[PDB]
Amino acid sequence: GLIVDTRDVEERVHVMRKTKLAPTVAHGVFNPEFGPAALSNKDPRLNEGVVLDEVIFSKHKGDTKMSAEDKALFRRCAADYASRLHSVLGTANAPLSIYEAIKGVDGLDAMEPDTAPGLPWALQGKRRGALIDFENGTVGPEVEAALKLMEKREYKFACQTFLKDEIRPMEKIRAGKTRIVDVLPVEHILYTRMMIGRFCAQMHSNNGPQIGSAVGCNPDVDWQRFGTHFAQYRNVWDVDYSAFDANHCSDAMNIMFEEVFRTEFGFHPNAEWILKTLVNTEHAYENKRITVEGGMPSGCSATSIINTILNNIYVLYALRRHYEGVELDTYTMISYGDDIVVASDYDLDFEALKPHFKSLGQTITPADKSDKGFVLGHSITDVTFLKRHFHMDYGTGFYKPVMASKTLEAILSFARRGTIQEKLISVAGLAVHSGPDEYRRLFEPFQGLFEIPSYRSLYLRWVNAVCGDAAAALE
Ligand SMILES: [Mn+2]
């Protein structure tokens, strides 16, 4: 995005600044090239003469401005993708009730308590539970005040910038490339789910290539569905972006909101409005008041979906801007926010597309980062998606989501105090696809210390999960 105003205020919005991630016994055994993010300017492990607060905002390199022709083209791609999208999902996008927005529906999880509620409930020492009733599905005084202020299209807000306390590669840590979360007010989040929560629900349960979205998928069972789809195509590309979230330009955002969330598709008129309030935002990080034009706030509750929608339009736009007669069936794809797999029987040159993507302020890059650029002939078994490869299971003949063993080591090395046991069982479900020998090795350090699920129990669980027929095809 484009920063238009840095300014200082003495009501400090303080951030966290040390990690919750204590090492585990796995740490000493594996010695991973990973560790907690850098949360303090004083962090020893940070390269000398690097201040945490500046590199944070180096992602805002400008808000790309598009020509009248490129905008008309983008609008067509947005309208075409929107056409596909609503054709699959239907047009029953009437506002969710407050109860339904709090508690969720089929396809949409309930809103969370115990997480941040944003501003200025941080400035009033007010906690999520104090504003809304999560079991009752009801709201309090000022949030209802703020609710019917957004009806009236007035709503003053700022984003609260947090530092993401997470495991990162040791280099990102010495470089101080700590990721950030923009926590919006809880009234913003719930209203957004009132405006578009029914649509998001439909997206989740209809995830797949046809809508180009994996948001709400279950990789354990859906890898078979996705893998077999992309195996049918002659070319498969693993496309990476540089700072996808931050580089959504004002023109692309506004136009996608205008084309996707129209009232003719059964949205309330305020769906477009509430989404449009994410374009020019207000970030109370570090020295509080920083104003940004362009880019998507990293974290809203519809971020994954919005980043997915834009990703789908970006690809259509880039291809149409280089080739002629490019339509939605010219290629296939699936994405999850910035993460994307593309495939086609056409021999599309993603190296030539680079500038066309750059007209949107987006920089595409091959996943390898080697060769010299995008090559052809790659298949579904060469790519990473949701940090998972596609591999064939020997026993079933299904695709399984395999994670890099060194990534699993990193995840197994650090954990919050008192959660290790739960985290192991959780991570066991991920590691089971790495095969029995590597599974045994990854969980060696916890032998006789924590309960470790047997490889066989999770394999049988997974087999039935992929489809009961396979599990029943035995015995
Ligand atoms: Mn990727």
Author numbering: 1 to 475
What does the paper say about this structure?
Here, we describe the selection, isolation and characterization of a FMDV mutant with substitution V173I in the F motif of 3D which is able to survive the mutagenic activity of FU. V173I does not produce direct resistance to the inhibition of FMDV replication by FU, but compensates for the increase of A → G and U → C transitions that the wild-type (wt) virus endures in the presence of FU. The structural modifications associated with the altered nucleotide incorporation have been examined by comparing the three-dimensional structures of the wt and mutant polymerases by X-ray crystallography. The complementary virological, enzymological, structural, and computational results presented here support the conclusion that the V173I substitution in 3D restores a required mutational balance, opening new perspectives on the role of mutational biases in viral and cellular evolution.
To investigate the structural modifications associated with the changes in nucleotide affinity, 3D(V173I) was crystallized and solved in two different crystal forms at 2.6 Å (P41212 crystals) and 2.4 Å (P3221 crystals) resolution, respectively. The superimpositions of all 476 amino acids of the two enzymes showed root mean square deviation (rmsd) values of 0.33 Å and 0.62 Å for space groups P41212 and P3221, respectively. Despite overall structural similarity, some significant changes were noted in the polymerase N-terminus (residues 14–18), and loop β9-α11 (residues 293–302, at the N-terminal side of polymerase motif B). In both space groups, the electron density indicates high flexibility around residues H14–K18 and this region could not be traced in the trigonal P3221 crystals. Two types of changes were observed in loop β9-α11 depending on the crystal type. While in the trigonal crystals the G299–S301 stretch was disordered and not visible in the electron density, the tetragonal crystals showed a 2.5 Å movement of G299 to S301 from their standard position in the wt enzyme, packed against the fingers, to a configuration where the loop protrudes towards the catalytic cavity in an orientation that would disturb the binding of the RNA template. Thus, localized structural changes are associated with altered nucleotide incorporation tendencies of 3D(V173I). Thus, the parameters of presteady state kinetics suggest that substitution V173I attenuates the mutagenic activity of FU by forcing recognition of the cognate nucleotide.
